[PDB]
Design a protein around this ligand. Structure first.
Ligand SMILES: Cc1cc2nc3c(=O)[nH]c(=O)nc-3n(C[C@H](O)[C@H](O)[C@H](O)COP(=O)(O)OP(=O)(O)OC[C@H]3O[C@@H](n4cnc5c(N)ncnc54)[C@H](O)[C@@H]3O)c2cc1C
Ligand SMILES: Cc1cc2nc3c(=O)[nH]c(=O)nc-3n(C[C@H](O)[C@H](O)[C@H](O)COP(=O)(O)OP(=O)(O)OC[C@H]3O[C@@H](n4cnc5c(N)ncnc54)[C@H](O)[C@@H]3O)c2cc1C
Ligand SMILES: *SC[C@H](NC(=O)CC[C@H](N)C(=O)O)C(=O)NCC(=O)O
Ligand SMILES: *SC[C@H](NC(=O)CC[C@H](N)C(=O)O)C(=O)NCC(=O)O
Ligand SMILES: N[C@@H](CCC(=O)N[C@@H](CS)C(=O)NCC(=O)O)C(=O)O
Ligand SMILES: N[C@@H](CCC(=O)N[C@@H](CS)C(=O)NCC(=O)O)C(=O)O
Lengths: 462, 462
């Protein structure tokens, strides 16, 4: 027997939840399949617990300033277990909320692991029961990458971001491998909270896909906060020792000779080297659904797979791996399918990003170099500033704020905004709305500043 | 003898500095007259020292959360003298910077008090020396209002915001009189830093000129932080006592009878009841320059006075009493006069405001009621939310975030944004650029959210 629905969603994370909820608002008879915990990566091992830990780190960093602001110093050690328990309770509250959001919307929850069957009409099986719909969304997300043993013997002795959220104590000594935003965020949290932390990167700077100003500044800020940035460095082997692990590293700086270094007494080795899509056990081959060589589901601009009636959104597709992107793509898809809006799709240009470094980073649009490639060097003008926020006027510890505006053509259309500094996490959203609207530099300069803030610096560049 | 300039600016605060510096860039031979300290109210007794004290208060409030975030509590008393000295040093650094900005621009600094003379050609005298120009800008600012003794005997025993910045110790007991932003900010700082604080207001709520949602929320947040809000209350008399002052108050709540209350043992009585323009000793009558009954210089939309070749900007005109407004009006005036741009003027609509309450307030555009008056009730739609920021997921202390979007007509043009919450101080600027550009609700909803932030709530209202 086969149960039929209007909409079957595989995965109860950001993209699947949002798409199912919007489809149900439009009248669809929907079901969500979930093998683990509702909320997916965002709620359980991603956005939310990361942010709680960032808030904890931020608090610690600021308290380094308590005597400078007139208070007796706070000479106190952090207790990781206290915040771990509170973080876990919050996650549990969210799991309950998202379950209720589906129930209240009359969306069926199917608990178990879905795979496709060979039925020519697309059908899935979950725990030996079959389900079909004219519309099936694959929203199964991804998972952290780990090196293979054949490449890096002992790599399984390391953990990933998933294991980070299972830690019950602060590691004394941490080595984070990677140079992307997850690596940066994890290193900054562990160091702020008192771990002796190193960040191992393949080149000279972190965040190399970001604007050059951000890549440079973020690297410098990491070092100024006490993160040891191990440049031009790669892990060759990991061994268990009486104390933690020993990491064998090769460093090969341009202009120097390669050198092997052992890093002893490592408590936490964290691989933050990429993400792999969760498609291996879906039985995609039974329907000929197209993937790349990494396992990502291939889609068009409307989130269609190569198979009629099958769609994919979110991290499983490998493009713009953010919660709001999964959500927006899922909602736009629901309006296309169930409101019949044939042009409903997500625009992947001008998606804003925040990285929860110390201080945070915000970016939207094109890097300076991307704009030069697109528009021509003679047709791009940048404006930038660097300053110390007035929060630090009275402190011995310092952080900087850097801002860059990238403008194109005679009208100076704002095609990119890039910044790092106190407040940049909350500052970016509104600027992203202006950029999406096609703001020019004149539109910024025509807006009266708010004083005293960091944000006014973006409307007073000259 | 009379020295001639292209541009004479009376007052070296925000408006005068900015206008003189822009005129000099355009080639004007300019001079600034200043009787006290360069930087005016902004640097010396306003924006900057207020913000330092807000940062100090904010730090204190957050440290109330230190144990909840896993650290041993910070059981420590504040030392006002520590931050007072650091604040004063910062002010001195700024005085030196603005002096240098004028010198580097080849702007003459004339030290002393200016007044007009009776010369038919507009001329000023400073320390017995006369100066003239075809263009004279009056940018003399204002000062705090204090009640007259004939109205409130003993009112001179109180202080104003000026005296707040001279305090050398934390008052044990403070009573702040007023219901506008300065009163709110001063009460919140004094209470956060440990003073037993009352805020005395004439009606039921603070910030009555702001959107109703903000007025309500700000009042509630003050009370939840421990500020005693004395509603429907007015000072009748002040007397010196062996301990501080005794404030005689009359309270007259609608539906109840009036009652007299003595408030004993008050260390600081702070009048925050308004601002008066600094025009009494300018000898404006010698040239027939027009003022209102409160002393404000009357201007047109181009900052012209009623006398050819004489202009006014900033607080002396009584409209939109903010530093960036003075600056922008002064710069626009310089382009009009010295670049010959006859349409160069400041648009006073859609000026954004932040109030440094706890948490901060941001607003731009029309209140809901102003929009209903302008557009008609049937043509205004509001969207709002209220939530607890995730910073407080792990804390026993709570603050709320409230947000309101005011939309007009079928297209839902965003004509007002109003919020209070963590981050709102840095969040508003970019939204103000969108509003100034004529954003509609669709423009907001077309912008991809940034997660997890408070700011995303403004682009996901339904
Ligand atoms: C450490 C970390 C920090 C991050 N920080 C941020 C950030 O600050 N902001 C941001 O916007 N993004 C951030 N992200 C990215 C964001 O979490 C992801 O982009 C988003 O969760 C992806 O949503 P999704 O719906 O594609 O997949 P997921 O949320 O991963 O959901 C997929 C769901 O499918 C389920 N599932 C998988 N296969 C099956 C199957 N066959 N049958 C049934 N169920 C199945 C899984 O159990 C899971 O619940 C972060 C991620 C990580 C790991
Ligand atoms: C407590 C407080 C907090 C504030 N908070 C903020 C805030 O957070 N953000 C914001 O944008 N605004 C804030 N403001 C308002 C802002 O400070 C003022 O709007 C701005 O300083 C006004 O600038 P101005 O140039 O008009 O006048 P002023 O800065 O007052 O400058 C006038 C100058 O003229 C000089 N002067 C006066 N008469 C003469 C004379 N005849 N001859 C020579 N010199 C003379 C004075 O000494 C002074 O230096 C605050 C103000 C106060 C008091
Ligand atoms: S961490 C869980 C995610 N929540 C959000 O990203 C907030 C979404 C906004 N409230 C919005 O866009 O409405 C999530 O996965 N949400 C799925 C959902 O259905 O909201
Ligand atoms: S508190 C002194 C004031 N500074 C600002 O308001 C910052 C101004 C911005 N940097 C800008 O608009 O450029 C001030 O009074 N400034 C006068 C000046 O000439 O900047
Ligand atoms: N505007 C910035 C820089 C400080 C400044 O204006 N001086 C801030 O408030 O930190
Ligand atoms: N987005 C807000 C509300 C929290 C939420 O999304 N849950 C925040 O990050 O505080």
């Amino acid at each position: 027997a086969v149960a039929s629905y209007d909409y079957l969603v595989i995965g109860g994370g950001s993209g699947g939840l949002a798409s199912a909820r919007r489809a149900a608002e439009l009248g669809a008879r929907a079901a969500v399949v979930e093998s683990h915990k509702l909320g997916g990566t965002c709620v359980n091992v991603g956005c939310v617990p990361k942010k709680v830990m960032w808030n904890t780190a931020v608090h610690s960093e600021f308290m380094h300033d308590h005597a400078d602001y007139g208070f007796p110093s706070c000479e106190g050690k952090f207790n990781w277990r206290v915040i771990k328990e509170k973080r876990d309770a919050y996650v549990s509250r969210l799991n309950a909320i998202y379950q209720n959001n589906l129930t209240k919307s009359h969306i069926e929850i199917i608990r178990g692991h879905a795979a496709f069957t060979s039925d020519p009409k697309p059908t899935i099986e979950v725990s030996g029961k079959k389900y079909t719909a004219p519309h099936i969304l694959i929203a199964t997300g991804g998972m952290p990458s780990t090196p293979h043993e054949s490449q890096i013997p002992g790599a399984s002795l390391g953990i990933t971001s998933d294991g980070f959220f299972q830690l019950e104590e602060l590691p004394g000594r941490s080595v984070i491998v990677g140079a992307g935003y997850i690596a940066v965020e994890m290193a900054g949290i562990l160091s702020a909270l008192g771990s002796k932390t190193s960040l191992m990167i393949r080149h000279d700077k972190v965040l190399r896909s970001f604007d050059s100003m951000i890549s440079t500044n973020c690297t410098e800020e990491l070092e100024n906060a006490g993160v040891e940035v191990l440049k031009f460095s790669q892990v060759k082997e990991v061994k268990k020792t009486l104390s933690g692990l020993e990491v064998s590293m090769v460093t090969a700086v341009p202009g120097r000779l390669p050198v092997m270094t052992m890093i002893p007494d490592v408590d936490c080795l964290l691989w933050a080297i990429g993400r792999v899509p969760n498609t291996k056990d879906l039985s995609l081959n039974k329907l000929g659904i197209q993937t790349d060589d990494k396992g990502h589901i291939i889609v068009d601009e409307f989130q269609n797979t190569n198979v009629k009636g099958i769609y994919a959104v979110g991290d499983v597709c490998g493009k713009a791996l953010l919660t709001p992107v999964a959500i927006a793509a899922g909602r736009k898809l629901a309006h296309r399918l169930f409101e019949y809006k044939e042009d409903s799709k997500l625009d992947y240009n001008n998606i804003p990003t925040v990285v929860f470094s110390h201080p945070p980073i915000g970016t939207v649009g094109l890097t300076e170099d991307e704009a030069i490639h697109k528009y021509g060097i003679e047709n791009v003008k940048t404006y930038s500033t660097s300053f110390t926020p007035m929060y630090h006027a009275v402190t011995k510890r310092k952080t900087k704020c850097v801002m860059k505006m990238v403008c194109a053509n005679k009208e100076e259309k704002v095609v990119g905004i890039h910044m790092q500094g106190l407040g940049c996490d909350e500052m970016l959203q509104g600027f992203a709305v202006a950029v999406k609207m096609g703001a020019t530099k004149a539109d910024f300069d025509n807006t009266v500043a708010i004083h005293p803030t960091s944000s006014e610096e973006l409307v007073t560049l000259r």
